[PDB]
Structure formats: structure tokens, C-alpha cells
From a paper:
The crystal structure of a truncated hexahistidine-tagged variant of the EncFtn protein (EncFtnsH) shows that it forms a decameric structure with an annular ‘ring-doughnut’ topology, which is distinct from the four-helical bundles of the 24meric ferritins and dodecahedral DPS proteins. We identify a symmetrical iron bound ferroxidase center (FOC) formed between subunits in the decamer and additional metal-binding sites close to the center of the ring and on the outer surface. Despite a radically different quaternary structure to the classical ferritins, the four-helical bundle scaffold and FOC of EncFtnsH are strikingly similar to ferritin. A structural alignment of the FOC of EncFtn with the classical ferritin PmFtn shows that the central ring of EncFtn corresponds to the external surface of ferritin, while the outer circumference of EncFtn is congruent with the inner mineralization surface of ferritin. This overlay highlights the fact that the ferroxidase center of EncFtn faces in the opposite direction relative to the classical ferritins and is essentially inside out regarding iron storage space (boxed region). Furthermore, the position of the calcium ion coordinated by Glu31 and Glu34 seen in the EncFtnsH structure suggests an entry site to channel metal ions into the FOC; we propose that this site binds hydrated iron ions in vivo and acts as a selectivity filter and gate for the FOC. The constellation of charged residues on the outer circumference of EncFtn (His57, Glu61 and Glu64) could function in the same way as the residues lining the mineralization surface within the classical ferritin nanocage, and given their proximity to the FOC these sites may be the exit portal and mineralization site. The five metal-binding sites on the interior of the ring (Glu31/34-sites) may select for the Fe2+ ion and direct it towards their cognate FOCs. We propose that the oxidation of Fe2+ to Fe3+ occurs within the FOC according to the model postulated by in which the FOC acts as a substrate site through which iron passes and is released on to weakly coordinating sites at the outer circumference of the protein (His57, Glu61 and Glu64), where it is able to form ferrihydrite minerals which can be safely deposited within the lumen of the encapsulin nanocompartment.
Numbering used by the authors:
A (entry chain H), B (entry chain G), C (entry chain F), E (entry chain D), G (entry chain B), H (entry chain A), ...: 7 to 97
D (entry chain E), F (entry chain C): 7 to 96
Amino acid sequence: STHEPLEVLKEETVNRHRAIVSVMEELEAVDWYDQRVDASTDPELTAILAHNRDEEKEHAAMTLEWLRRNDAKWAEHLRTYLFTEGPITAA
Amino acid sequence: STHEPLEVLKEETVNRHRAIVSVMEELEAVDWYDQRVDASTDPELTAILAHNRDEEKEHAAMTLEWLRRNDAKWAEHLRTYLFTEGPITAA
Amino acid sequence: STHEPLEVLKEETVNRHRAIVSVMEELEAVDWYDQRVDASTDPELTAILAHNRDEEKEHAAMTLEWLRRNDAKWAEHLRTYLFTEGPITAA
Amino acid sequence: STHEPLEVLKEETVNRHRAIVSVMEELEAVDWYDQRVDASTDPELTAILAHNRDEEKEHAAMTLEWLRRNDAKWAEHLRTYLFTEGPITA
Amino acid sequence: STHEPLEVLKEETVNRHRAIVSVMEELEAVDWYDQRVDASTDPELTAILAHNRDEEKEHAAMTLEWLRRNDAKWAEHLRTYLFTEGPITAA
Amino acid sequence: STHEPLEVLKEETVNRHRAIVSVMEELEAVDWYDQRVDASTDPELTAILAHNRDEEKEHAAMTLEWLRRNDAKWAEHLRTYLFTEGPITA
Amino acid sequence: STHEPLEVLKEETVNRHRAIVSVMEELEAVDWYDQRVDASTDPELTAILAHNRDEEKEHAAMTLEWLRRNDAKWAEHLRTYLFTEGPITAA
Amino acid sequence: STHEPLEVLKEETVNRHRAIVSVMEELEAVDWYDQRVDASTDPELTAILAHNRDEEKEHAAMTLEWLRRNDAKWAEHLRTYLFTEGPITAA
Amino acid sequence: STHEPLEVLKEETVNRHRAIVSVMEELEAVDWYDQRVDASTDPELTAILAHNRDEEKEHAAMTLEWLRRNDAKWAEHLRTYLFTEGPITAA
Amino acid sequence: STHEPLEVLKEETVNRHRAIVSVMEELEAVDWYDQRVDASTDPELTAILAHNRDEEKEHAAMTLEWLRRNDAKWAEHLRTYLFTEGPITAA
Ligand SMILES: [Ca+2]
Ligand SMILES: [Ca+2]
Ligand SMILES: [Ca+2]
Ligand SMILES: [Ca+2]
Ligand SMILES: [Ca+2]
Ligand SMILES: [Ca+2]
Ligand SMILES: [Ca+2]
Ligand SMILES: [Ca+2]
Ligand SMILES: [Ca+2]
Ligand SMILES: [Ca+2]
Ligand SMILES: [Ca+2]
Ligand SMILES: [Fe+3]
Ligand SMILES: [Fe+3]
Ligand SMILES: [Fe+3]
Ligand SMILES: [Fe+3]
Ligand SMILES: [Fe+3]
Ligand SMILES: [Fe+3]
Ligand SMILES: [Fe+3]
Ligand SMILES: [Fe+3]
Ligand SMILES: [Fe+3]
Ligand SMILES: [Fe+3]
């Protein structure tokens, strides 16, 4: 699932790939579940969709913390913007 | 680009969809660029790919902070795991 | 996200569609996470990937149980095969 | 059809992959068929579509049972929720 | 799932479409299952795969007979070639 | 275009794959052409579309006979339903 | 199957779209069948594949003639290059 | 980009594949551009789109002539139908 | 082809969408033709592929110029980097 | 991610491939972000989307300048059309 041949990729690059596509898949699941929660017309299904939705956010956060500990630029930019106040574009 | 009809989705659900697919696309770009950075055999191109790569991480971080500010469970789970030490699964 | 126009689909068909597509996506996440667990060369990442993997199995089982309660034929066939011993093809 | 090279995957991982994608494909067929059953305006076709639909559930159930027998946490989590009463999120 | 808008398609064209895509999907399942049957290294799984495989052929055959009964050229061409002997291109 | 590596597939399996994918593509063309025939507002084009459509059916029927001759379960199930009368789900 | 909404498209444009996509699908079948013909290890199947292959070329040629009759620039460029000798880039 | 492994394909088959997929891509560009021409509400863009469209037809015709010179059935079938008069299905 | 409903998109956004997607498709064609030029083993075909390739670049440049003239930020950023000589990341 | 096998492609072809798909992805991001800016009903999100949008144009422009410096026909055709006056077609 990589775009370049594995023999020219550094191991750390490939591990970061694994982490990044995981976050991508978690975000997609968050998004789809939230849409299904709004549209669902069954209360028992809605409670299940909403529970799964919010656990995906936890999955994403864990993997994003791993990216942060293993990439100086993820560390730098996440530190600049996360948990701030005032206009996000002026930080 | 939504899986459910727009008329049954809450406004904040659609705006979070816009933000979430944006973060997904930034992540994809990070990964793609980093792979091309490893495989490139032209250092002038490599310099452009790496420059672009790291700005995508900033675009992702900005959008993630917006999500964090506009979604309680994103705020909760990001607070739990980001900028921690020790085992990520037990934070 | 349906193959037929929503206005000819019964309400229950559309809810089962939401549940079915959720189980599909969970199964896919299990499989992909398990492959990344095998291939990962970073122990902290591996711990995270395996943690998320097993929670997707729980998201799936919760949704399958909803399908079972809301579809007589799922109930019948799941009852026949799940939690049995001996040859599966002979139950 | 795997995302990681086969030489780094354990045999058991690959067999579970085969089962898992089988279940996915059965689920998809159940959903597709059910929608076509609702939309179809020919009763003879509808009968075929519905027949096929419910046999895919059986295909899915059989494959899922194998998965369950060959993966400890599938077995654990399915045991928690399947054939229960009261709120599923509990 | 139609290539043309439903509002210009005749009802019977749309029903034949439902049948054709059904057969297409069955054929795909037969093929994927057979490939998994050859590659599987667990005999209990292999037996299930083979079982499912052969029932997809029956799903296809039922739907093909519906097409034969509802389309005169399907009827003509299936009668010319199916269950014949000697060279297929010379029937 | 196979989901499993070629080195573990039997030769006959790969040939059936060639046949099956051919039939799938013929069916897709039949369907696509029939929709275009319905939507077309040019009679000369429609005539071409309809002609091509019905020849795809012949392409499919030929390849389907090859499968019937080379796969016992295709022979069995095709024989149960094809050229029959009364309700198909029986 | 169009990229723009049908009500902004001229009728004739939509009919040329039907013809063009038909030719595209015929070309694809020609290519795939030809590849299957080279790879097949069953002579009887190969004869069916080659027979079908060459009839796709006729389906394509027929539809292409309609295009030529209904589009002045198709007529111009097909006239310039088809059935010529010497270097194609110098026709 | 081939469906069969390159080692079982004849060189000529692969060159024909390169030409066929080129024509397919040209036809797709012709169609897409023609749709954007009808839909555009900017005349300067429209003139560019129309210009590109008609040059794609030329690219297709050139490549189609190469196929004709390198494939007996293309030569046969193109000769039968192109630049004819009266009903196309009857040449 | 758009990701948001057309009725919420400004007319100029939609026209820029048409141009942007045209450039993307032109770039794609340049890349694929260039790959086919390298791999082709028939010199007559290679000459056609190379000719078409280089015309796609002209199609892209024309459309890129339309974007330059109709979008302030494209104009600003293209002006900064196009037709320069020093190291690209420092302009 | 190439359509031809890497061992038949020149090094320069593959690096141009890396730049071109990068430009394509940048163009796609510009378009998607621009559509989201129009549709967004959250002004704080809109400002992030617009910021990111315009930085993608800069990423594209850098990469495009690299292509211009490494491909004689890109340089020739870009020089013909960019930053010109009068009708784009007649330049
Ligand atoms: Ca997913
Ligand atoms: Ca992208
Ligand atoms: Ca390992
Ligand atoms: Ca059975
Ligand atoms: Ca399927
Ligand atoms: Ca049965
Ligand atoms: Ca096709
Ligand atoms: Ca009509
Ligand atoms: Ca294209
Ligand atoms: Ca200068
Ligand atoms: Ca250079
Ligand atoms: Fe998850
Ligand atoms: Fe970005
Ligand atoms: Fe999940
Ligand atoms: Fe099935
Ligand atoms: Fe089936
Ligand atoms: Fe055909
Ligand atoms: Fe055909
Ligand atoms: Fe072209
Ligand atoms: Fe072009
Ligand atoms: Fe970018």
C-alpha cells in the first residue's frame, strides 16, 4: 500500500506510514459514524453508533501521540496549535 | 461527499465532515511526500517535497485544533494522550 | 450511500444498511490493523495497533448483535453456527 | 489483496484475512440484495433476490464461526454481546 | 447504481439491471472464493470457502434463468451454446 | 488481477478466472448498452448500441458454456435452472 | 455517468458521450481479451477469447463511424490519419 | 498496468496495450472537455476547453491509425465502416 | 464531479474547478505518455506518444494561464517561482 | 505508482513522475478546499480552509517550477502562455 517500492523506504518512514494511514482510517470512521448517528431512526442502533464513534477518536489520538513522539515536525506543529486560544490562523 | 442526505445531518456534523476529510487529505499528503522524499534521486526536487511535506503537518494541526475546539470527545481524548510520557495505551 | 433510491427503501432496510456497512468497516479495520501489527518494527506502535484492533472486534460484535435482534434470518443463521463444535459445514 | 507484503505476515494472519474479506463480501451482498428486493418491480425476480439474500447470511455466519474459533478476542467479544437482552451498550 | 438517470429508463430495463449486477456479483464471489480455496492453509476454512463458492454458482444460475425468461436474445444465445458438444465457436 | 499470488493458484483456477472475468465484463456491457439504448435520442446510434448489446450476450453465452464444461458445479447448477418452467426458486 | 449536470448539456453532447464511452469500453475489452488470449493455457477458451476480441473491434468501428458522421472535427482528423502510409506524425 | 504478468505477454500485445489505453484516455478527454464546454460560464475558458478537445481527437486518430497498421482485425473492421454512407449496421 | 452541492458553490468557484480538473488530467496524460515512451518497443508508436505528450503540456500551460488570470493567489505564487534561476525553496 | 515497470523507466522519467503527481495532488487540494470554503457555515473553519488552500497553490507553483527546469517542452510551452496578454489560444 506504499507508493514507492519498500526497498528504497527507510524503516522509520514505513512505520510512520502505518501510523498515518491508521489515523486516516480512524478519522473516516469518526466521520461516517457521526453521519449515521444523525440519520439513524433506531434508538438502539444510534447508541451503538455513537459509542463506536467516540472510541475511534481515542484510537486516533493514541496514534497521533505516537506520530508526535516520533517526528520532530509533527511535534513542533502540534505544540504550536493544540490546546490554544484565539484565532487558529494567528498562532 | 456525505454518506447520508444533507437534510438529515446537523450543521455541525457537516462542518466536522469538512474538517475531518481535510485532515485525512493532509495526512495522505504527508505520507505520500515522505515516501517520495526517500525515493527521489534529485536533491532539488527532494528539497521541495520535504518543504511541502512539513507544511501539510501544519495544515493538519490547525484543523485538528478546530476539531478539538468544536467536539467534546475530541477535546477529551486529545487531552488524555497528547504530550504525555510513558506507555501510550495507558495514559 | 445506497444502491437504490432511498424513497423505495423501507425504513428497516435503511437501518440494516447502516449496521451492515458499519460491521464491514470494522472487519476491514481488524484485518488491516492485524497486518500492520505483523509488519510493524516499532514496539510502541505495535502495542497501539493491537489495542485498537481488538476494540474494533468489540464494535463489530455490538453491531452484529443489533442485526441479530432486528432480522429474523440473521437470528436463525447466527443461532445455527455460532458457539458450536465440530465441522462447521455440517451444522 | 494484502496491504503488507506476504513475507512479513504470519500464515494465521493471512488465513484470517481470507475469512474476514469473505465475511465483508457476504455482508455487502446481503445489503445489496435487500435493497434490490425493496426496489424490484418484478415478483419472480424478487423471490430469487430474497432467496439469495438469506443464503448469504448463512455464508457469513459460517465464516464468522470459523473466525471466532481461530481468534481469541473475536470469541471473547462475540460471547459478550451475541444472544443477549437489554441495552447492547452494557 | 445506473449509468443513465432512472427517469429515462424503462422499468423493465431497471429490473434487468438488478438481475445483471446480481449475476456479476455472484461471478465475482465464485472467482474470489476459488482463489482463496487454492491459497488457504487451514483445511476447516477451505471447506467453508468451497461450500460458499458453489452456492454462489446456484445464485447466478437462478438469476440467469430469470434473464433468459425476460430477454429474447439472452434466450436465443443461451439456447445456441449451453449444453452442447463439439467446438463452442462452431455451435 | 488475481487476489492471491499466482504461484499458489492451480492453472485451471487461473483459466476459470479468465473466463469468469470475461463473462462479468460482457454482462456489464449488456447492461450499459441497454441503458444507453433507452436514453439515446439518436435512432442511428440506438441501432448500433442495440446491435452491439445483443452480440455481447452471445459472447457471454459462449464463455459460460466453457465454464459449464470445465466446472462440475457450474454444470450442476446451470442444469437445475436453465431452460426450465414453473417458479425458479424451486 | 456525465461530469456535468444533464440540464446544462446539449442533447447532441449527451449522445456523443454515449458513443464515446461505448468506444472506450470496446477498446478496454479488446485489450483485456488480447492479454487473456496470450496468457490462457486452455486452447478452447483461447479460441472463444479471440473470437470475442475481434468482434469488439467491429463494435468499436461501427460506433466510431457514427461519431465521424456526427462531429466535424472527428471527421476531419480521422480523414487526415486513417488509411495512410508513411510517418503518422507527418500526415 | 496490464492484467496478466508481462512475462507471458508478447511484446506486440504490450505495445498494442500502450496504444489502446492511449486512445481510451483521449476519448475520455474529448468527452470531458465537451461537457465542460457546454457548462462553462466563462468564454475565455470555453475557447481553451474547445481547442484542447479538438486536439485530443487528433491524438486519438493518430494512435488509432497505428493500431490499424499493427492489427489485422482493426484494419479489416475500420475499413468496413469508416467513411461509408447509409445505415451503419449494414456495411 | 464536485464535492459540495452546486447550489452552494459560487459560479467562479465552479469555473475554476473546470480548469483545475483539466490541468490535472493534462498532467496525468503527460506522465503516462512519458512512461509509455520509455517502455515502448515500437519506434512508430513511440513517436506518436511523444508528440501527444508534448501537446498535453501546451494544453496544461494554456489552462494554467487562465487560472493565473482568474485567481489572485495563483497569480501571486506562480509569479514568485516560475521563470526563476536560484534555488526554488528560497524564492 | 508507475504504469510501466521501474526497470524500463529512466531515472529522470520517474522523478518527473514524482513531481507531476505532486502537482496533481496539490491542484486537487486547491479545488476541494475552495469548494469547502464556499460551503462552510463555520467562519473559524473557513479561515483555516482558505489559509491551507492558498498555501497549496504555493506548493504547486514550486513543484511546477522544478518541472519547468527539468523538461524542455514544459519550459517552452509555459513560456509561451504564462503571463501573456490577449487571447490565450492565439499566443
Ligand atoms: Ca475504513
Ligand atoms: Ca489528495
Ligand atoms: Ca513482525
Ligand atoms: Ca446450505
Ligand atoms: Ca462483491
Ligand atoms: Ca442453496
Ligand atoms: Ca468494461
Ligand atoms: Ca427512450
Ligand atoms: Ca484521463
Ligand atoms: Ca531571470
Ligand atoms: Ca536538474
Ligand atoms: Fe478504530
Ligand atoms: Fe495541505
Ligand atoms: Fe471501530
Ligand atoms: Fe455468498
Ligand atoms: Fe451469492
Ligand atoms: Fe463483448
Ligand atoms: Fe463489445
Ligand atoms: Fe491528448
Ligand atoms: Fe490534452
Ligand atoms: Fe500541499
